[PDB]
Design a protein around this ligand. Sequence first.
Ligand code: 3NI
Ligand code: 3NI
Ligand code: 3NI
Ligand code: 3NI
Ligand code: 3NI
Ligand code: 3NI
Lengths: 117, 117, 117, 117, 117, 117
Amino acid sequence: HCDLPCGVYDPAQARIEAESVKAIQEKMAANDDLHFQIRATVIKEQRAELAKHHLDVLWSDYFKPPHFESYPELHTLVNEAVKALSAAKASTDPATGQKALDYIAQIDKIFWETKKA
Amino acid sequence: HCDLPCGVYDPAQARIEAESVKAIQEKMAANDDLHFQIRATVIKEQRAELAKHHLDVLWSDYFKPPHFESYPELHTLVNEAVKALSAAKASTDPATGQKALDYIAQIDKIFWETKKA
Amino acid sequence: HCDLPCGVYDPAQARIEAESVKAIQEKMAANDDLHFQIRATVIKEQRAELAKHHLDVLWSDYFKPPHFESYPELHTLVNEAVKALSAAKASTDPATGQKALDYIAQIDKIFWETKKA
Amino acid sequence: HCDLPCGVYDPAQARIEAESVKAIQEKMAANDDLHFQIRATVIKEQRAELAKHHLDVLWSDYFKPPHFESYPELHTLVNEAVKALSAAKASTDPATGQKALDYIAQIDKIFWETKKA
Amino acid sequence: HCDLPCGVYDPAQARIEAESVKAIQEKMAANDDLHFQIRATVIKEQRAELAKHHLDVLWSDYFKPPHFESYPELHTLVNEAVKALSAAKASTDPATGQKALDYIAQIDKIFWETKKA
Amino acid sequence: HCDLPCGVYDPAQARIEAESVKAIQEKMAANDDLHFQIRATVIKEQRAELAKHHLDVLWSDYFKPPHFESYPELHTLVNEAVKALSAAKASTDPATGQKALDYIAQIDKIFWETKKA
Ligand code: 3NI
Ligand code: 3NI
Ligand code: 3NI
Ligand code: 3NI
Ligand code: 3NI
Ligand code: 3NI
């Protein structure tokens, strides 16, 4: 995942960050304090960006050309996932964070299928 | 390109970094001093990574579903471009840097066409 | 622009980031939503910083003593441009982003003139 | 793990980076090409640093005074783990990478025990 | 402090960042303008994080087993110092910034004592 | 030094990093091991870059127009200092690191004079 290549990848990296994004949105609904809302927004932006980065790495470095042929929906799937993360950045609604997590789950399923193959 | 969204994008960001990658490769072919080789390798790695990031952003943020339907080869084209940048990191051969640049020029063309549409 | 040196520089990197800064200010004029305003501020801060960095690099790395002799106003000009960017971080008024872009255009002109010599 | 706090932590973040560190060391033993050795060194340095960062965060943010009381060896354990990572940065011997992984697994065990209580 | 190791460390790095944190909190009380409050919060967050990083480096890289033996309360002290910085991130009260600075000064004193022996 | 502005600045941030640069160069003069030479070069590059950044910040944010009028050679001085750091990046000779330190010490002096005015 470092581009050496090192041969070590795990969608878990993107997932843990996307999980913080949703967790942050949930906490934002429980505290309307201005300063807390600013910090939560700041931090959610950073964790969603990392989640996007991790997905980007899987897309560009892990997945090889044959994988996109074997899973015709893979390009679209990863693109929708990073876009859902962009949508979560601009929202305090936990559903947006959950949507990104749902796409990550599908990508994770494909990732492991390709690992065992 | 900042995900606000700000509406400002330009493949030139990716291109300028890819140009540095090739330029460093050319300089490496001309000076075999150990320390220069280390520094050149370290720096080429960073610039190639920034070029990958910029292309990733065009792919994840600028390009929308309509664009992928109009250019069915776009997903693969950007994926190949970033993969070419990974190969450039692993190489001192300027041709690898040029390969990345050729792909970037193709993405640049499509980018501007979508901007005029 | 990577300090190898690689021999590749372009005021365009500073310009593109400064354009995002102003573009963000324009979007802040239009929408008073708290979360949007927090996110716009956060991201504007990040892009203005990158723009200052790019200018600092032109100043520290690209421009040499003969350039400062030929253009005795260059130091002041670049210093005014980065200070204008600091002013843009602290403002939502596009006039501040515009002022930074104006100084950058002046720096860009001098840059290309030095590429002619 | 983002200091909001968000309530999401997983030692897996530290483990995955440490796994890359060891995997890179193994590749370095098998390929003596100069450029590969430089790239592997640069990248191992980066992943080891990320691993130390993740451990530092668990120590500073996740673990609380009651945890250090229940596990009097914990401060020492995390300190040894990060020092083991510093040692791996300075080494191409996979055994150093393995030692950091051994400590991370002991930290992971304690982490999950605090989740049961 | 760079993990080479280089043999150069100075608690002053943590202190200067902690001083910005407090200085920012002092300024937050004198201007309730929204944008200023957002920038102040955003920037305080960043400076506090850097201060935590500098303390983490002292703890992980500079201080060694003999030092922890001679100062049995050092682990707790550094851990309390970084937690104080986390508290300062979540507060506009300069008292929180002060508390972190006070812990840092204690660490600074111990640091110079270990340097004299 | 964070651009809020926070009112906290200290040339010591730049000095400490330049000190590491020189300390690393001294170590490189003594130890010829390839892997150590790679790590030292990699890390020296990073610390020299941070030193340049700290100097750039004093120049762009701390020093104001009246300071440049009061000390006309300040622009040149900071420019030479950052160029000396670029030179240190490209050399293993401690003398280059010392030269950067000498320029920083001249800047430190003017800095404190402006503080007392
Ligand atoms: Ni990897
Ligand atoms: Ni943008
Ligand atoms: Ni360059
Ligand atoms: Ni967190
Ligand atoms: Ni160091
Ligand atoms: Ni500041």
